Amino acid sequence: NYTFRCLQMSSFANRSWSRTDSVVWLGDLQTHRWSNDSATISFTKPWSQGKLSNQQWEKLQHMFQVYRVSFTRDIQELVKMMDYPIEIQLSAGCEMYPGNASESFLHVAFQGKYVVRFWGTSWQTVPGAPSWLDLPIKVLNADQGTSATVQMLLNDTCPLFVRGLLEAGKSDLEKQEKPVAWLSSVPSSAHGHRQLVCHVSGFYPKPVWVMWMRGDQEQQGTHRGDFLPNADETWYLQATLDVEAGEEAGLACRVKHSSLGGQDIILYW
Amino acid sequence: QKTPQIQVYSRHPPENGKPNILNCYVTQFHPPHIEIQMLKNGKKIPKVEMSDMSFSKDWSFYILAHTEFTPTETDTYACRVKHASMAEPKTVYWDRDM
Numbered sequence: 001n002y003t004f005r006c007l008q009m010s011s012f013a014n015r016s017w018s019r020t021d022s023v024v025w026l027g028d029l030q031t032h033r034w035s036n037d038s039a040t041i042s043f044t045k046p047w048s049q050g051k052l053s054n055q056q057w058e059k060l061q062h063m064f065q066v067y068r069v070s071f072t073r074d075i076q077e078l079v080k081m082m083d084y085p086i087e088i089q090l091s092a093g094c095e096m097y098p099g100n101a102s103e104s105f106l107h108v109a110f111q112g113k114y115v116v117r118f119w120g121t122s123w124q125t126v127p128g129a130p131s132w133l134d135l136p137i138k139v140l141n142a143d144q145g146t147s148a149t150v151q152m153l154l155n156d157t158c159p160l161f162v163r164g165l166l167e168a169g170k171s172d173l174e175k176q177e178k179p180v181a182w183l184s185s186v187p188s189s190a191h192g193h194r195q196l197v198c199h200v201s202g203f204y205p206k207p208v209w210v211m212w213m214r215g216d217q218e219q220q221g222t223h224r225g226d227f228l229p230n231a232d233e234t235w236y237l238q239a240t241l242d243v244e245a246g247e248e249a250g251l252a253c254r255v256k257h258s259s260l261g262g263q264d265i266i267l268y269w
Numbered sequence: 270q271k272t273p274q275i276q277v278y279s280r281h282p283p284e285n286g287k288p289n290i291l292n293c294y295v296t297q298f299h300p301p302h303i304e305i306q307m308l309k310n311g312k313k314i315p316k317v318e319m320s321d322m323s324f325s326k327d328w329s330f331y332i333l334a335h336t337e338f339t340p341t342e343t344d345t346y347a348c349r350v351k352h353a354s355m356a357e358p359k360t361v362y363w364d365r366d367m
């Protein structure tokens with residue numbers, strides 16, 4: 001059901017230029033941003049504090065503030081034993097299943113490649129990560145206060161925090177926005193052929209069905225594009241169909257979405 | 270080091286003379302540093318809003334650019350991207366029919 005992700009983006013350009021920016025997502029809705037230019041974590045939702053008090057939130061914000069600083073110089077300290085530019089990414093949070101179950105994760109990439117994870121009670125290099133990581137990671141493991149801190153956060157804080165996020169942001173998370181749809185076409189590279197396009201925009205949540213129809217028969221040639229984000233926290237998708245000139249008549253585009261109330265949108269070419 | 274992909278689409282059904290929002294959605298690049306320009310008839314568009322940068326499950330960065338725009342019969346609209354992975358800026362033009 002719900003994936004919560006805290007995404008860290010850290011660039012080291014040289015011995016003394018570096019930046020660490022983060023964004024936090026609950027599903028496809030941004031909950032927070034934290035700019036390198038900024039002292040404190042910023043809310044991007046009215047509910048971004050979840051069920052936590054101000055005392056708990058500040059405490060938790062404090063531990064991330066010490067972390068952003070310590071991460072920076074631990075990494076810098078590491079480089080000066082070894083090649084710039086360095087890009088490190090970190091993806092941390094939890095997947096929320098129904099029945100109050102959950103699973104936490106903490107994955108770290110270097111140069112756009114997954115290399116280290118936190119798992120159970122220790123940091124681990126992922127198989128085929130560079131061997132030079134072994135020593136730094138064994139050394140970091142020897143730091144029990146950091147490792148007890150991470151377990152705490154992954155095992156308790158994350159799901160606990162997410163549960164209040166889901167309560168507090170219910171009317172955003174459970175929101176329904178209707179798709180509006182339109183048709184166009186375009187030539188294709190093979191002479192006497194066309195590509196019909198069915199564009200579907202402005203819908204929420206993500207699950208949708210878009211198919212080109214001839215009566216009741218689904219046109220299996222329907223080619224679904226990727227889900228593309230709009231800027232108003234809705235989705236965009238298009239489905240194309242290649243057809244022969246003349247053979248266009250009677251083709252329809254039909255879209256199904258949870259907010260339409262069981263009445264599909266049907267457009268006719 | 271990955272090359273950016275560019276998708277340009279409108280928020281609502283285009284119709285000439287009616288105010289709209291044009292999106293440029295830049296995916297799949299690395300490293301995260303990048304310059305995105307939205308262009309009108311080759312002139313850079315002033316008031317362009319960008320999303321915070323983020324990345325997907327496969328680690329590649331993506332970013333949403335968008336501006337207000339009223340489409341007409343004669344105006345062209347493009348999205349240009351400078352990135353370390355590309356010898357040369359990449360431009361993809363909005364095509365209301367695609």
Ligand SMILES: CCCCCCCCCCCCCCCC(=O)OC[C@H](COP(=O)(O)O[C@@H]1[C@H](O[C@H]2O[C@H](CO)[C@@H](O)[C@H](O)[C@@H]2O)[C@H](O)[C@@H](O)[C@H](O)[C@H]1O[C@H]1O[C@H](CO)[C@@H](O)[C@H](O)[C@@H]1O)OC(=O)CCCCCCCCCCCCCCC
Nearest residue numbers: 067070071074078079092093108110116145146149153158
């Ligand atoms: C939006 C809300 C959602 C909430 C749910 C979140 C779910 C996800 C959880 C994500 C949490 C991520 C982990 C951060 C947790 C944390 O607190 O870390 C703090 C820790 C704190 O360490 P610090 O250095 O600040 O201090 C230590 C410790 O401090 C203690 O006190 C802190 C609070 O004041 C606590 O944060 C900490 O847990 C701990 O209790 C350590 O335990 C002590 O033993 C140590 O002495 C101390 O050192 C300090 O003092 C000494 C001076 O005497 C100095 O030697 C030293 O430099 C430092 O000043 O700093 C670090 O460990 C940074 C290093 C992490 C790097 C791991 C990434 C792996 C890299 C991947 C490889 C890539 C390739 C490499 C490229 C070359």
Ligand SMILES: *[C@@H]1O[C@H](CO)[C@@H](O[C@@H]2O[C@H](CO)[C@@H](O[C@@H]3O[C@H](CO[C@H]4O[C@H](CO)[C@@H](O)[C@H](O)[C@@H]4O)[C@@H](O)[C@H](O[C@H]4O[C@H](CO)[C@@H](O)[C@H](O)[C@@H]4O)[C@@H]3O)[C@H](O)[C@H]2NC(C)=O)[C@H](O)[C@H]1NC(C)=O
Nearest residue numbers: 103104119120121122147148149150151152153154155156
């Ligand atoms: C946050 O949540 C995680 C779970 O997600 C907890 O991590 C687990 O912690 C326990 C106890 O520390 C770990 O259990 C120990 O594992 C050893 C074997 O591990 C291997 O086998 C298991 C599966 O078979 C794998 O998951 C693991 O990766 C290894 O391949 C056992 O040998 C240990 O038993 C021996 O030592 C203990 C001392 O702790 C003695 O008491 C025993 O009698 C025995 O001689 C031990 O049972 C467990 O493996 C961890 N899970 C994972 C998946 O890594 C964190 O504890 C939790 N943190 C907090 C603070 O709540």
Ligand SMILES: *[C@@H]1O[C@H](CO)[C@@H](O)[C@H](O)[C@H]1NC(C)=O
Nearest residue numbers: 012013014015016017018085
């Ligand atoms: C560090 O990197 C930045 C480039 O992003 C540059 O402006 C700065 O001068 C660099 N420092 C030096 C002198 O190497």
Ligand SMILES: *[C@@H]1O[C@H](CO)[C@@H](O)[C@H](O)[C@H]1NC(C)=O
Nearest residue numbers: 016017018019020036037038
């Ligand atoms: C990011 O933050 C650190 C600590 O505040 C600062 O010294 C650094 O210059 C910032 N990075 C940039 C490029 O502004």
